[PDB]
Amino acid sequence: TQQPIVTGTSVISMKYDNGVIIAADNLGSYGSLLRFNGVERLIPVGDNTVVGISGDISDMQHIERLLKDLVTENAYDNPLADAEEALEPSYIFEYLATVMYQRRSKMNPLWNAIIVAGVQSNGDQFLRYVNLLGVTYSSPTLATGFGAHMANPLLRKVVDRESDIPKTTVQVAEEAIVNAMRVLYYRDARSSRNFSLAIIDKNTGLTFKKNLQVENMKWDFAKDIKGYGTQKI
Amino acid sequence: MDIILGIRVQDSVILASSKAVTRGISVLKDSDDKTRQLSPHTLMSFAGEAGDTVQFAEYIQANIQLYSIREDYELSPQAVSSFVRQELAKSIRSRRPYQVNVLIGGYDKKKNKPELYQIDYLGTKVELPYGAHGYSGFYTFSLLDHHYRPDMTTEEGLDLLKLCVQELEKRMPMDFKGVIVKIVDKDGIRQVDDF
Amino acid sequence: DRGVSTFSPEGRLFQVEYSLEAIKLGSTAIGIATKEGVVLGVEKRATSPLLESDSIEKIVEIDRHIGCAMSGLTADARSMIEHARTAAVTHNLYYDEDINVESLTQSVCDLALRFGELMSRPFGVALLIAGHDADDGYQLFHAEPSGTFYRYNAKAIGSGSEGAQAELLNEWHSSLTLKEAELLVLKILKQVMEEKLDENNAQLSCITKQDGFKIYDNEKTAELIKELKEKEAAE
Amino acid sequence: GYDRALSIFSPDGHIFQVEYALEAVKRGTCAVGVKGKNCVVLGCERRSTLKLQDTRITPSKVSKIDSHVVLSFSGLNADSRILIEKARVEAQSHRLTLEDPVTVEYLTRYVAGVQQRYTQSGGVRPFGVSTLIAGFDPRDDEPKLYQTEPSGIYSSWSAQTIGRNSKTVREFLEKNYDRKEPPATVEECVKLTVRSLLEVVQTGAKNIEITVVKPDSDIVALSSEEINQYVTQIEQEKQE
Amino acid sequence: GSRRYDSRTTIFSPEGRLYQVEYALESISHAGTAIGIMASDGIVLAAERKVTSTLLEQDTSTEKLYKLNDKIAVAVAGLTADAEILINTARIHAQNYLKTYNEDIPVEILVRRLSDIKQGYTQHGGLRPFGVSFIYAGYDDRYGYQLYTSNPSGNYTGWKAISVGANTSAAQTLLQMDYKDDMKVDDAIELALKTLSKTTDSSALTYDRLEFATIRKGANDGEVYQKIFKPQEIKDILVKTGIT
Amino acid sequence: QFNPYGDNGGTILGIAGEDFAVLAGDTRNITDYSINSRYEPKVFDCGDNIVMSANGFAADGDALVKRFKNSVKWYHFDHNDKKLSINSAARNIQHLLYGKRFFPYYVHTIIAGLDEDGKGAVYSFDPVGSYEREQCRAGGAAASLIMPFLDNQVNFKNQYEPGTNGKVKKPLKYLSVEEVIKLVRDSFTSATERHIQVGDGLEILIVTKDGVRKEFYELKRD
Amino acid sequence: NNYDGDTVTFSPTGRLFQVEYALEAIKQGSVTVGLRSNTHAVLVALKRNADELSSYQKKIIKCDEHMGLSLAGLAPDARVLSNYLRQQCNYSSLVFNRKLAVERAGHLLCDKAQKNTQSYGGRPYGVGLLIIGYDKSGAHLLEFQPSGNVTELYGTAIGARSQGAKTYLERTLDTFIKIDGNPDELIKAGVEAISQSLRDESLTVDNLSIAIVGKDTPFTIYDGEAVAKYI
Amino acid sequence: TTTLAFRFQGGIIVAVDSRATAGNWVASQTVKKVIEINPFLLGTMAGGAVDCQFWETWLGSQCRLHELREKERISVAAASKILSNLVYQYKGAGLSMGTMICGYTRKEGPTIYYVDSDGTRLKGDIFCVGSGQTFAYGVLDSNYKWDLSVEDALYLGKRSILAAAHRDAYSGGSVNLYHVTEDGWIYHGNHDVGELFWKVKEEEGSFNNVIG
Ligand SMILES: *[B]([O])([O])[C]([C][C]([C])[C])[N]C(=O)[C]([C]C1=[C][C]=[C][C]=[C]1)[N]C(=O)C1=[C]N=[C][C]=N1
Ligand SMILES: [Mg+2]
Ligand SMILES: [Mg+2]
Numbered sequence A: 001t002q003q004p005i006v007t008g009t010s011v012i013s014m015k016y017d018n019g020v021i022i023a024a025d026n027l028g029s030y031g032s033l034l035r036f037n038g039v040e041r042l043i044p045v046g047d048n049t050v051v052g053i054s055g056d057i058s059d060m061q062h063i064e065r066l067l068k069d070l071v072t073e074n075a076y077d078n079p080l081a082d083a084e085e086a087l088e089p090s091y092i093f094e095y096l097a098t099v100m101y102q103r104r105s106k107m108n109p110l111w112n113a114i115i116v117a118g119v120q121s122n123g124d125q126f127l128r129y130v131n132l133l134g135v136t137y138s139s140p141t142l143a144t145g146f147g148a149h150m151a152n153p154l155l156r157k158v159v160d161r162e163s164d165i166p167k168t169t170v171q172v173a174e175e176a177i178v179n180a181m182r183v184l185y186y187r188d189a190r191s192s193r194n195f196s197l198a199i200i201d202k203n204t205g206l207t208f209k210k211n212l213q214v215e216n217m218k219w220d221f222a223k224d225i226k227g228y229g230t231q232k233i
Numbered sequence B: 001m002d003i004i005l006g007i008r009v010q011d012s013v014i015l016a017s018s019k020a021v022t023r024g025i026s027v028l029k030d031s032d033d034k035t036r037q038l039s040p041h042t043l044m045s046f047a048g049e050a051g052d053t054v055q056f057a058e059y060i061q062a063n064i065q066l067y068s069i070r071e072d073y074e075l076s077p078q079a080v081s082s083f084v085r086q087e088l089a090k091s092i093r094s095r096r097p098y099q100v101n102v103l104i105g106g107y108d109k110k111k112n113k114p115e116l117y118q119i120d121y122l123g124t125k126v127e128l129p130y131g132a133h134g135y136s137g138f139y140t141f142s143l144l145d146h147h148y149r150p151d152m153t154t155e156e157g158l159d160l161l162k163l164c165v166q167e168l169e170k171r172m173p174m175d176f177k178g179v180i181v182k183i184v185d186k187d188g189i190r191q192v193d194d195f
Numbered sequence C: 001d002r003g004v005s006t007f008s009p010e011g012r013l014f015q016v017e018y019s020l021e022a023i024k025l026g027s028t029a030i031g032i033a034t035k036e037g038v039v040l041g042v043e044k045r046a047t048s049p050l051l052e053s054d055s056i057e058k059i060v061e062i063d064r065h066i067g068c069a070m071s072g073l074t075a076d077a078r079s080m081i082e083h084a085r086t087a088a089v090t091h092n093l094y095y096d097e098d099i100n101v102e103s104l105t106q107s108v109c110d111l112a113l114r115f116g117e118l119m120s121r122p123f124g125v126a127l128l129i130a131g132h133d134a135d136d137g138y139q140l141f142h143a144e145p146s147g148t149f150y151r152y153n154a155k156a157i158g159s160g161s162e163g164a165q166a167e168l169l170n171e172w173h174s175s176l177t178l179k180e181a182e183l184l185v186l187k188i189l190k191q192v193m194e195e196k197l198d199e200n201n202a203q204l205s206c207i208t209k210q211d212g213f214k215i216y217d218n219e220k221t222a223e224l225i226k227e228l229k230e231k232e233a234a235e
Numbered sequence D: 001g002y003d004r005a006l007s008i009f010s011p012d013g014h015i016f017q018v019e020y021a022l023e024a025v026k027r028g029t030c031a032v033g034v035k036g037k038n039c040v041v042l043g044c045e046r047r048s049t050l051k052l053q054d055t056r057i058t059p060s061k062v063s064k065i066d067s068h069v070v071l072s073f074s075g076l077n078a079d080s081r082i083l084i085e086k087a088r089v090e091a092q093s094h095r096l097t098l099e100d101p102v103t104v105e106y107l108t109r110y111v112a113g114v115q116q117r118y119t120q121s122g123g124v125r126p127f128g129v130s131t132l133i134a135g136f137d138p139r140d141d142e143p144k145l146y147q148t149e150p151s152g153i154y155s156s157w158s159a160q161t162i163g164r165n166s167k168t169v170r171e172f173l174e175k176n177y178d179r180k181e182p183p184a185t186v187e188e189c190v191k192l193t194v195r196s197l198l199e200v201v202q203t204g205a206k207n208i209e210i211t212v213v214k215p216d217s218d219i220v221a222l223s224s225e226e227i228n229q230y231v232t233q234i235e236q237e238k239q240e
Numbered sequence E: 001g002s003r004r005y006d007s008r009t010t011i012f013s014p015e016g017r018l019y020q021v022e023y024a025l026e027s028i029s030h031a032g033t034a035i036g037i038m039a040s041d042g043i044v045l046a047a048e049r050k051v052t053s054t055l056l057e058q059d060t061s062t063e064k065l066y067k068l069n070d071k072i073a074v075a076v077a078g079l080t081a082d083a084e085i086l087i088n089t090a091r092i093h094a095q096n097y098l099k100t101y102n103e104d105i106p107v108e109i110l111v112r113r114l115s116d117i118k119q120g121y122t123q124h125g126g127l128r129p130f131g132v133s134f135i136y137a138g139y140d141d142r143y144g145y146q147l148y149t150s151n152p153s154g155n156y157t158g159w160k161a162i163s164v165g166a167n168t169s170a171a172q173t174l175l176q177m178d179y180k181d182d183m184k185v186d187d188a189i190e191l192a193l194k195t196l197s198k199t200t201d202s203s204a205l206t207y208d209r210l211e212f213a214t215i216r217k218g219a220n221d222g223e224v225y226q227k228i229f230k231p232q233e234i235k236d237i238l239v240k241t242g243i244t
Numbered sequence F: 001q002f003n004p005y006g007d008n009g010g011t012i013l014g015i016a017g018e019d020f021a022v023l024a025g026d027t028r029n030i031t032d033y034s035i036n037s038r039y040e041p042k043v044f045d046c047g048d049n050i051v052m053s054a055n056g057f058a059a060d061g062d063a064l065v066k067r068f069k070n071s072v073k074w075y076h077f078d079h080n081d082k083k084l085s086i087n088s089a090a091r092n093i094q095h096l097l098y099g100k101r102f103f104p105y106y107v108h109t110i111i112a113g114l115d116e117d118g119k120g121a122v123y124s125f126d127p128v129g130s131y132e133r134e135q136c137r138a139g140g141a142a143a144s145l146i147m148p149f150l151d152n153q154v155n156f157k158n159q160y161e162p163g164t165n166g167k168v169k170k171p172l173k174y175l176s177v178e179e180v181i182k183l184v185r186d187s188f189t190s191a192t193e194r195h196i197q198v199g200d201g202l203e204i205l206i207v208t209k210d211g212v213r214k215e216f217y218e219l220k221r222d
Numbered sequence G: 001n002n003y004d005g006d007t008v009t010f011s012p013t014g015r016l017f018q019v020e021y022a023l024e025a026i027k028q029g030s031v032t033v034g035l036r037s038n039t040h041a042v043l044v045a046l047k048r049n050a051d052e053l054s055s056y057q058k059k060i061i062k063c064d065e066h067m068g069l070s071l072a073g074l075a076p077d078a079r080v081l082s083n084y085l086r087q088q089c090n091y092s093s094l095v096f097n098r099k100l101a102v103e104r105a106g107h108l109l110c111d112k113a114q115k116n117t118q119s120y121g122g123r124p125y126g127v128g129l130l131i132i133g134y135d136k137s138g139a140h141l142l143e144f145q146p147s148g149n150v151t152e153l154y155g156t157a158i159g160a161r162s163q164g165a166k167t168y169l170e171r172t173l174d175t176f177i178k179i180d181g182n183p184d185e186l187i188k189a190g191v192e193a194i195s196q197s198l199r200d201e202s203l204t205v206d207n208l209s210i211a212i213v214g215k216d217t218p219f220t221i222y223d224g225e226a227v228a229k230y231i
Numbered sequence H: 001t002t003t004l005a006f007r008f009q010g011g012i013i014v015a016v017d018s019r020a021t022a023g024n025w026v027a028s029q030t031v032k033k034v035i036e037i038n039p040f041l042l043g044t045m046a047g048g049a050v051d052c053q054f055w056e057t058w059l060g061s062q063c064r065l066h067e068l069r070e071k072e073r074i075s076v077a078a079a080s081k082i083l084s085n086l087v088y089q090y091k092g093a094g095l096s097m098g099t100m101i102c103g104y105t106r107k108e109g110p111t112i113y114y115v116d117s118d119g120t121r122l123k124g125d126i127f128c129v130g131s132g133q134t135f136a137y138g139v140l141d142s143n144y145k146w147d148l149s150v151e152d153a154l155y156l157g158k159r160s161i162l163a164a165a166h167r168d169a170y171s172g173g174s175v176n177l178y179h180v181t182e183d184g185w186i187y188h189g190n191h192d193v194g195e196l197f198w199k200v201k202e203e204e205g206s207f208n209n210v211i212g
């Protein structure tokens, strides 16, 4: 049993017709202090998987090393390491999901919420969640922390059920993700303007976008707001 | 369990022990014998936490019986009491201590003397003319302080014991359903069937 | 000296092969499987007339649906029986059912090769494990100290084994009755035994679906011996 | 730990260490067991090479395992103590858990199991001891007499002997013991036990020990004079 | 592997003997003779030191007679270093028994314990046995004065008079000849020294070649006194008995 | 302080027919007042014509089902591809659950299938492994809403025959698979209305001698 | 000679005799054949009986839904090794939700057998195994030797008189590799291959044991009247 | 829970209720609170459902192993002590059990042992265990005799459970009756309290408080 120290906030994601999108801001908070402004919380594994991690950053860095080590280990005595026997999103997830549940069972959890986004060998979209308790679930849209409360409602308006996935293009999906990130910046007191976004498409592969910023923000209306009720000046 | 008494007279040791076994709300049994014969001339009564009492008593009994067979010889009451004390003194610093208090009444055939030892769950041993565990002593020690004379006969000891049990039956809140009395002397151990 | 788990140049474990020699010195045990039941019979072979022969326990119950006969260093069998009994009962506890005779035999045979430098040597005893289950019906297995077990329609182990096996070769057919099998075990035991066969120096047993495993009384076996004598004198 | 396999099979299918343990038993002083109709008697040889002995304190050959069961032996004396101790512990353990004393068969089965375990355990040699275990089951008047040996096999006997010159006394018992009518009384049973030892012992003085066990934990060891009276009566009848 | 070099100390011969025990007994047969004699009013322990030197500091020397507790003592025959290992174990066992039962350990119980330890080295562990034979001289309130002996096999027996070490055959014959049941300590002292004087491989028996001890109820009233004799006291008793 | 347990909501329902058995369960997965997934399968085909669901804390539920499926696999290896009977599966599950008696699988387990006589069977478990064969059992969040309805409409409790006035009970006539599915659907529709953790979808697994069939129905998504 | 007392001793020519003696136990074992195409992999095993009353010793063991082997030599050693494979296949499924690769299964067997050849006290395994399987890279056939050497092959045979079946497969290489989408013809070629290792005895109904795995075919074993079709 | 067992002329009567609760929620009305350990031994269940179940069917495995090893039926004393010694090892861990081990043997006759998760093991003639034990005791103690017929003894046990089923909120459902002799136990049916109450009320003239 511990307490999280340096923490990362929401990770948001959704499926679309040819793949999956995942995003997370670049902040490492130290309680109310916005301590570290250059933290990458999307960690790619091969060219077909991206693992988005929230929660404790020291435990994230530990998980990052496990995944790095997993790639190394898979390559050993494996002539098809970059082909048929390459790591799948489903393999990477189940490994993490095993570790998370084992650690919670020893009463010493990795204090994280993880979303594994990727595309399988057969072109199928993979998107599944796991957290410090070993709880796992899948959905057309997945989000951690504040994202669960604010992003999911917006993303579910695009893909409300399974049959909406083929009808959703990458442009519409990315637009929804970027809007959700803006909303989180308005409303999450432990978020940052700077974020990373990753697209895993079955045709165009892995596109990893760094140094994105929340833009087109509405603040002008603030000038008209005066006092807390009766004040006019 | 509740009330266990002991009194050492001229030529014997007398142990009285309640018959009631109460588990919270109800009295499950009114004929329970809270004692074990460790050897032909050594008797141990006991009272404490449920389960622990019998488990401990039978464990001690087995060990003394083992000794008796190995050496073809009966340990002195003093020796047995010292063995018991060590087990409890070992027990008190265990993961889960034996929560048992005991009285060891024996007749030493070598010295031709009755002997009564009082040992609590901490391993606190004392040799006494008369003893008790729990709240029994609070009522009975005053009577015994007054009446006990060390040259008493076994019949006088039983009468003094009746006076103790009567006082307990008058002033104690719990109904302990009377006592089973046992006498330990040169001829061994016997039970007084009418008390 | 040399390792306990050493291979010979022929590709056999020395100690396993030597334990098989000890089993050849053991008293004869015979098993016959039929569609009406499996019969198990043994030679008691008391070393002296003062030895109370009914204390010789070379046929043993593992469960209600599984029996066992032994041959060789019979003292070694006790831990094998204990394991078998525990395996049978434990499986009933985990699965609320009887354990398959093959599965029981496999569990016993797993102990066999757990020796090295675990126990210091292989078992010096062979077992005939007979039983019944719903899936494969009446079965007879021969469990060796090599860890190998063969299923048999009929089998003889011990000192008079190859002579008895040749006799079982001719006599066994798939339509044998239980009564016919009982007499057949008695017939072959009488053939290979040194001393004259009677109810005190030979013991019978069987396993049926209805009644389960039963060791025969000396009075019951005595009648089957008398029935045998008359039918051999009949031609 | 020392794990060396000492007891192992030989090409002819023998475990020599177990068989050499039997040779140690052959060397040991003779011990005999005879059961009557309502009693069992255990006779034991004391070699008279050792005089100036203190017979009060010298370990007696017959040992009580419980108040109703006894154990005598032939072979290595030091080894026998280990078996007796284990047996006594198991006897008390059985009373503690089953709330009933051991049967003579159960106690024998335990001791035999210990002996067997030492024939296929690493780093240990077999016990150089064969035992005669005798007594009466709780609330039972049927006499019991069992024998064990280093290999771990055990069995029940109407009468049996072990140790040096046991071949001779077994010869005697085989012709003199009738199963249809065993020694009806204590006297007859003790007499037959002393007679059987007199075939081997040498002098009937302090060389014969006799222990009589009767039902309901009634065990007593005969004294020198009591045994000497049997020795006297046997030879006076023999002079004819 | 290592098997190649294993002597196998705990095995039977074809005849059913324990090789190492037999060879340990052969070792002990060359050790200085030790004699124990039990009387009605006490026990005597006499023992011969092995070919000493004039430059050996005798008054601070101890190779034969050791104290286990106030009631029990032992005479050693064999490897002294081996004996001290067992002696320290025995001393602890006596103290464990005292702490547990608050009574001095009965002699036989102590003897059985040491003998069981010796036995263990003959049956398991693959180690050599202790090349030691003890004579236990002790007293308790059950059996009174007791003499025992134990050897590397772990077998022990009780005695009225007994010898261990060298020339036990000759020594035991002499004891068997002159020993009587109604004997007293002063007489037993004389018998012990006379026996050593005849069985010794030395030219003459002197004070500097002896260790001597008595366990007497010759202590003021109902109690027991151990007396480990000093060099001068051994010299006096040698003159008294008429050996020097 | 770290709390190793959580509540993923949901509700399950097992009903044993005369020659069939059904095991139903909603597809909603939640924490607190949030929906994790509107379709997260909860009832699983474990092979050997046995269906299983471990409702409550989903991580412990998934772990248990995973370990039982594993137990079925090793039962085939160790016992010559023998079919694991529903009663034997039930006893095996008791030991799985009790193995963690002092750190329990925080779930309400139900299995369904056919007994060795071919009749419908449902077994129910508590978190620590106590079990019992039943004709009817609801488990999970809305179990308190559903069970009374099933006592009334499956076992005809408190129902009597008109005209007799309490003297003659309503006879316990058997229910068809079509009749059971109606009661299952009405149970979950009703449970969805009054329980916030129940909704989104209903997935029913039907077990007969022919095998395991699936049926899915929409539930209210509020 | 002097260097065959244990597995920890090289001979002067650099040989490990205990390993070679373990290899000898395989040659005494009954013949078994393995072969594959691009779609399916087949095991064929000649089972051996003790006598006419006895059963025929089982030769084929299932490790997973997509993998299994046939044995030749000490059967208990095959049980130990097949159990290990079952566990490794199972660990791969539970932890990684991934069917174990047949090549990786061979690597694991090699390393397990190796530890027994370098350490004192233990002994080499006394059995040879033919592992077939269908994974993400198609059909596979492995040959395991208890020296540790594992080899991926198109076809092979181990046991007594296995050289006859091995030569046949070496001739038929170009034919049977092309038998795609036809299990019965691939088994026929396997039954015809194992027939080249027979003397005196012939393939009967309780003598023959066949197993197959493929694209849409779980590892299944055929015994009894199920193989009468191929006799 | 209400369970009772009492010795009498015709052997032993064992009677139990059927209810299982989780708080105020009635979890089951059809619970088997009597374990058939073998054809001669019965065990009653009270307290934690699983603890009682698991360890009493385990007890049956230990009893079976005993009679395989000793070629003799296990005594009620030995069987009860196996269970009490087992739970004593777990003492403090939080096991929750109140059990009667009931049986007949030649050497003992009809015997009942109260075994307890605190380690208590008591031999006796009458025992009532569970939340509704006090209610059952009232009926039993006022109507008990050694000289009862198997028929009358069975009814007294049935009636004593009914008494507790009525008053104790955590008891009810139905009554399971057993009768233990020297040829084994004999089941005497499941008796629904919903029908038994009105039957007993009418025939016996009791429960005049309640309106029917
Ligand atoms: B009885 O009321 O003690 C009963 C006996 C048990 C064998 C079924 N126990 C229970 O009902 C307990 C709760 C309880 C109530 C009153 C006293 C003691 C205990 N219930 C459970 O153990 C349980 C098990 N599974 C589901 C629900 N409840
Ligand atoms: Mg005190
Ligand atoms: Mg809502």
Ligand SMILES: [Mg+2]
Pocket (backbone or CB within 6 Å): H164, H165, H166, H167, H168, H169, H170, H171, H172
């Ligand atoms: Mg009520």
